[PDB]
């Protein structure tokens, strides 16, 4: 059947005409196979035959079991067709679904049941070539949505939506969703009243030209849906003697997928082996870290876990734990500790951060995810003291705001590991530091002069102004005592250090962080260079 | 009859992602939009429309719909600026009182050129993507599109013609969905005149007090001290030297050379001769506007904002960096709420002064801003913005 639904008007892209691709000649088997296929399709109204008035054409092929398959190659038409609104903007996450008592599944096996805009059919013309390509072939055009055309998924789903809308209002308490060839229909009715309303829906579908002749758990989109719970469909981790790039990529994807419900999954050490572009077939020995990470993941996965569904009447609670080395993990529940969802956050935003910036970025990522899945932000439980957090964000120059949260004593706690002094330290030495690199030679010098008369200059190869300016500050911190004042000319290095990083991609910056933690007091100040400013011009001379 | 509207040559309609909405804002948009549809102001559309601009709900106690036409505005900027431009009166910034009136309901009476309507498409998302977003396009002039006041200009002139003729000293300026009405009247007579104007607008289906006269510059301030340490003078030299890049005349050497040798920061330093005096020139230099900086109408305005802490924020507006057209501060329960308020205040002032909104350089993570700004936004326009990492001492140099 061809649905009586009204058609969607369609246009070619502005300034373009429909395709005129030439049909390659085919084997007699393939011509025979296609005349048969097209004669059934013509009986059912899916296609019509047309004269030679129509100048448009799209190649057609046939490939074989003992089935024969028609293959209309819509590449040229597709790149001349307008764009459509896209079908799905996102996939529903299971953790956002509500508990259902009954879930039915009707067969709804598609495109050839939805009509195609009359003004557009001519551009779908195709030609069954005659034998050894001597007479003009038989010419058809589509009357329905052709398989493989750009507009079909969008126009089908829009048609399927208008058809359902009547039923969706007379039953605003029933959820209907479209998965492949099955329609999933869910209600909080018992099997009696449920499959009565299933019947009227199928009656309603039949009136629109749609034929309908599964038990939980439903396997869908990688998930396993049960009536009262959900999980990811089973993850089995291979037991290979030897690992290829290809095996580690597939394993990282599976662990990443499992992290949605299995808490604490780690992939950092396994991902680190994939750095440095190498062949998919090449074998990578596992470092001992990656083997401890693989070992830990296997224990996490030994017994199965499940997620619960969403109760709209209760709050969401989000908990975050620090797993170390930029790795964060989180759980969302409504009753402790029955998880709707878990996840991980392990992004380096910035070359240098601290745990407070990383925890706020993680809260931001969880907040957005909550809006999408549940339409509502959760209450946070975070491993950071209220005092730490408002010490940091008030003094810091970016704005922030995280929603309602509460401290939770789950170590490691987030804390600032050092504090720069607010004003210069009486009785402590003052270092005037400076770095410099020659842009040609990549050669540089770093050093200091102190108010107590000391001075040092080291030399540096394969270096930049940026690294010599940080080298100078590191020098000052090694040679000084527990308290020190440091005058630099580098806004670059002051910027970094005033942000109180506790981690960095630069081993230099990490060495400085090592030093700043041992110190009892450090005042850091900036002066413009090349203004003859006391010690700064004098240390500038040396470098 | 409808005014034909055209995009820029070889420009396509906007395809902007909808940001996720909370259940409460989705539900508000749904009711607003069903009522507009039954009144015919918008219509459901099918998948053959691939365009999108984002939509939000904001508050004045009752929800209001805000469509982000920023992208469309850029792609129709020949229509509303060079073809049907609304001229900006230099008189407005000189008035003692300026009242802002929303006149956006005017546009719901004018039909929109049917060949343009598809470009106004927008989506109401659904929670958890369980259902296809509800999709709509405009049939009338939409609020927030800079094409609307340009097309309505003809009619606005006919509405205001009696009131302008009877009050020749009042300046009325339209910007997007607002009227700016400025007078030198005493505040009571000014309010009375706003009331009469409301009555003129009410006979055609059209239903907050600024004092531009008192928008004083925020000069760069230099400390006045009893004693000066090494540290104090270094901070002073750094602050003067950065200031010298905006204010020609700023000099630092006399101050510089009492800092010679490598002395401790804590060492007290008595000022020298022209040293103490140059703090007088430099002070005298910095408390008056920049010579030779002028607004170029063909260039974009930029606004930079620094967080100073303790509920205070500084800002500068410029077109080419260091040549500030304006500098200010914003005074005084959330970092994002405060910043959202400063952005709205800076945009309003700059509508009044130049008839243009600035592009904002905002000191905040993008996702934090996009997740929270609508909880506090009250204007009907949206300026362009981008996210930046404030240089460390630019904040120290604009500190009070
Ligand atoms: C997004 C979705 C996907 C599928 C795919 C199925 C496949 N394959 C099926 C349905 C009905 C829905 N669906 C929708 O569109 N709105 C819903 C509200 N609440 C639930 N909850 C729910 C769903 C299934 C079970 C089970 N077993 C238990 C609870 N689903 C909803």
Author numbering:
A (entry chain A): 1 to 64, 68 to 112, 114 to 217, 223 to 552
B (entry chain B): 6 to 65, 69 to 215, 232 to 356, 362 to 429
Reproduce, without paraphrasing, sentences from the article in which this PDB structure was first reported:
All three compounds maintain a hydrogen bond between the aniline nitrogen and the K101 backbone carbonyl. The potential for a second hydrogen bond between the pyrimidine core nitrogen and the K101 backbone nitrogen varies between structures. This distance is longest with the five-membered ring at 3.4 Å, suggesting that it likely does not contribute significantly to binding affinity. Due to an opening and solvent-accessible area around the core, there is water observed interacting with ring B in the five- and six-membered structures of compounds 2 and 4, but not with the seven-membered ring B of compound 6. The co-crystal structure with compound 2 shows the most dramatic change in protein conformation. Notably, the side chain of Y188 rotates away from Y181 and sits more parallel to the cyanovinyl. To allow this shift, sheets β9 and β10 move, resulting in the Cα atom of D185 moving 4.7 Å compared to the RPV bound structure. Because of this, several amino acid residues become disordered at the periphery of the pocket, markedly from residues 217 to 222. These protein movements are possibly due to the position of the carbonyl in ring B and/or the wider distance between the arms in the horseshoe shape. Most importantly, compound 2 exhibited significantly improved phosphate-buffered saline solubility (10.4 μM) compared to ETV and RPV (≪1 μM).
